[PDB]
Every structure is written in structure tokens, then in C-alpha cells.
Amino acid sequence: EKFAFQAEVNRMMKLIINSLYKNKEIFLRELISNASDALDKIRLISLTDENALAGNEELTVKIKCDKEKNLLHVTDTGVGMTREELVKNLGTIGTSEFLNKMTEAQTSELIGQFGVGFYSAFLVADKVIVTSKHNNDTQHIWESDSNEFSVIADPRGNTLGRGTTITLVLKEEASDYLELDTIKNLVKKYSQFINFPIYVWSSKTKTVWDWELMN
Numbered sequence: 001e002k003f004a005f006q007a008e009v010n011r012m013m014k015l016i017i018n019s020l021y022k023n024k025e026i027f028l029r030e031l032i033s034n035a036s037d038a039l040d041k042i043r044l045i046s047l048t049d050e051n052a053l054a055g056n057e058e059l060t061v062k063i064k065c066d067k068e069k070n071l072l073h074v075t076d077t078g079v080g081m082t083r084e085e086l087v088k089n090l091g092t093i094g095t096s097e098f099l100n101k102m103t104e105a106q107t108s109e110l111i112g113q114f115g116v117g118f119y120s121a122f123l124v125a126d127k128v129i130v131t132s133k134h135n136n137d138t139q140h141i142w143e144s145d146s147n148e149f150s151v152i153a154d155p156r157g158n159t160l161g162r163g164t165t166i167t168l169v170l171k172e173e174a175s176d177y178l179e180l181d182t183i184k185n186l187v188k189k190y191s192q193f194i195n196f197p198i199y200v201w202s203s204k205t206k207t208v209w210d211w212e213l214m215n
């Protein structure tokens, strides 16, 4: 269940981290963008597949902060990833050209263009966990501290229905992303042009918690 990252991915992670150290908040923009892409994918599949949305009838992005556990969660009800996809799509990668472009650039816009924004999560996380459920497979968990990664069948079973949850164990210097005021402001900014509703789990005054629409 243990795997090593492809050399190119190791270099890419380092380039991204060294290039965006000044604007770490971009990680949320990238995770939201990826969630949107995943939702576009299942929507495209639903055009031809009548049972496509059976595992979860909604098309949304939901963000939750768990200050107590030092976790930030970004969940989408997109197409999800099979076990094989978790291993291949996150562990391997015009890569040589991009790597040269990044180096020749030192990148915010470039990263999104080449579709490697996911790795910016390491700008603010000591550990990145990806739980995913695809219609053609069972739920699995991918986890990595960037020095290796593992994939295991999720012992909780099918809790997502369909989709993916990106869970970030924040670095000590990234505790700000556990605060609602900050997350709501960033989510609002990065969700403006997303064509799917994005919600943040928040409080409202007793004190009641529920999903708050951000776009």
C-alpha cells in the first residue's frame, strides 16, 4: 500500500513550494478549481449515463474547518477517483517543459494551467489526505507527508456516496486557515466564477451551525 513519488513529481512539489511561499493562500483556489473540474466531469458523464448521479444526487463543494483537530476539509460530489486513479493521478505526472518554465519563471498562473495545483496544498499542510469514491470502485484513502504516499481501502466504507474529500493537516504557521472569517473571505473570492454552489460549514446566532452559501 506504500508508494514512492515519481522523481518529476518530487521536483515539481519543490518548485511550487519555493515559488508560492509568499502567497500560500492560493492552495485554496487550486483545491476549489479541482473540485469544480471534478463536478464538470460527472456532469459530462451524466449526459450519457442515466445512473451517474445515483450515489449522491447533489453537485456541490463543501468546506469545513475543524480547529480542534487542526484540519481543513474540502469536499466535492464530483466524479471521484478509483483506487488505480489515486495511485496514478497523484503519484505521477509537457512536464519537462513545465518544470523548465517554472525554473525559468523563478508561477501562480502557470501552476493552474498545467493542472498541478493540488501540490500547492503542501504549502500549508504537513499531511494531505484524499478520500475518494468513484461509481466504479469502493472508497479509498490516499495519504502523504510528501516523502512517500500510501493508498488503502477506507475501513469506514462508502460514506461519501460519490466524490472526494481533501483533508489537510495544517502546518503550525497555517493555523489562520482554521478561522471562519478568513476561510469565508478566501472561499468567496476563489468561488466567484465556479458554476457549482460552494458552501462553508459556519455558525450563526443560541449558536447554530449549518452550510452557508458562498457564491
Ligand SMILES: CCNC(=O)[C@H]1O[C@@H](n2cnc3c(N)nc(I)nc32)[C@H](O)[C@@H]1O
Pocket (backbone or CB within 6 Å): 034, 035, 038, 041, 076, 078, 079, 080, 081, 089, 090, 115, 116, 117, 118, 119, 164
Ligand atoms: C497533484 C497533481 N495532479 C492532480 O491534481 C490530479 O489528481 C486528480 N485530482 C486532484 N484533485 C481531484 C479532485 N478533487 N477530484 C478528482 I475526480 N480528481 C482530482 C486529477 O487527475 C488532477 O489532475
